[PDB]
UniProtKB/Swiss-Prot annotation, chain A:
Iron-sulfur keyword on record: no
Signal sequence residues: none
Encoding gene per record: 4
Transmembrane segments annotated in the record for this chain: none
Keywords: Degradation of host cell envelope components during virus entry, Degradation of host peptidoglycans during virus entry, Hydrolase, Late protein, Lyase, Viral genome ejection through host cell envelope, Viral penetration into host cytoplasm, Viral short tail ejection system, Virion, Virus entry into host cell
Official protein name in the record: Head-to-tail adapter protein gp4
Subunit structure: Monomer; homododecamer upon binding to the portal ring. Interacts (via C-terminus) with the portal protein; this interaction participates in the head completion. Interacts with the Tail hub protein gp10. Interacts with the tail needle protein gp26.
Curated annotation (Swiss-Prot), chain B:
Section covered of the full-length record: 291 to 339 of 725
Similarity annotation: Belongs to the p22likevirus portal protein family.
Result of changing V13 to A/T/M/Y: Overpackaging
Function, in words: Forms the portal vertex of the capsid. This portal plays critical roles in head assembly, genome packaging, neck/tail attachment, and genome ejection. Procapsid assembly may initiate with a nucleation complex composed of portal and scaffolding proteins. The portal protein multimerizes as a single ring-shaped homododecamer arranged around a central channel. Switches upon genome packaging from an asymmetrical conformation in the procapsid (PC-portal) to a symmetrical ring in the mature capsid (MV-portal). This change of conformation may serve as a signal for headful packaging.
Superkingdom to which the source organism belongs: Viruses
Subunit: Homododecamer. Interacts with the terminase large subunit; this interaction allows the packaging of viral DNA. Interacts (via C-terminus) with the head-to-tail adapter protein gp4; this interaction participates in the head completion. Interacts with the scaffolding protein; this interaction initiates procapsid assembly, thereby ensuring incorporation of only one portal ring per capsid. Interacts with the capsid protein.
Protein name from the UniProt record: Portal protein
Length: 152, 49
């Protein structure tokens, strides 16, 4: 992917907005880019609820290394589009803007597709209750005196 | 110690007795209802909960 850093993500979001790109004659001053990177970090941290949210492989920047922009985001090839579409939607209000309908639809689709595989993994069935008999047709358990499922 | 008689003094009583594959099996009347009764106990306990 050509989009390999948090600033690359922000640049793609701004280009999707139409605020600034490589072709424009006016560009955003770097405080704006730093604010957008802070917005991206806050959004990703809110998504990834300390390990219980959306799993993406995103690497949160450390304060010791100074510039967040320039750090690789660590996302897979398939999450970049979702993340930067959501970022465009999230940082549109800074510039007195409203993300267009196509951008909003793509943001929804990307977030859902991001959670799809983790939802499939998290859809698990709990073990048998502690009061559930093992069955006399299991032979091994009957002979080992393990007539009831442990549970929990 | 020699004891009286020509036979071993222990007499066994069997229920449903047989050999399956060179292995003894003997069964009463209770072995075969344990599954149903355990299930009934479990379902009654679930309903009481």
């Amino acid at each position: 992917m050509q989009i390999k850093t948090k600033g690359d993500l922000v640049r793609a979001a701004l280009r999707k907005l139409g605020v600034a790109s490589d072709a424009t004659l006016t560009d955003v001053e770097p405080q704006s880019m730093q604010d957008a990177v802070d917005d991206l970090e806050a959004m990703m941290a809110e998504w990834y609820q300390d390990g219980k949210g959306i799993i993406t492989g995103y690497v949160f920047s450390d304060d010791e290394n100074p510039p967040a922009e320039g750090d690789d985001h660590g996302l897979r090839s398939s999450a970049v589009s979702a993340v930067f579409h959501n970022l465009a939607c999230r940082i549109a209000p800074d510039y007195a803007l409203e993300a267009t309908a196509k951008i909003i639809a793509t943001a929804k689709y990307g977030k859902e597709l991001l959670y799809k595989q983790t939802a499939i993994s998290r859809a698990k069935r709990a073990p048998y209750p502690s009061r559930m008999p093992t069955g006399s047709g299991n032979s091994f358990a009957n002979l080992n005196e393990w007539h009831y499922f442990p549970g929990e | 110690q020699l004891i009286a008689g020509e036979h071993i003094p222990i007499v066994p009583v069997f229920g449903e007795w047989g050999f399956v594959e060179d292995k003894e099996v003997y069964e009463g009347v209770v072995r075969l209802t344990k599954d149903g009764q355990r299930l009934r106990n479990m379902i009654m306990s679930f309903n009481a909960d």
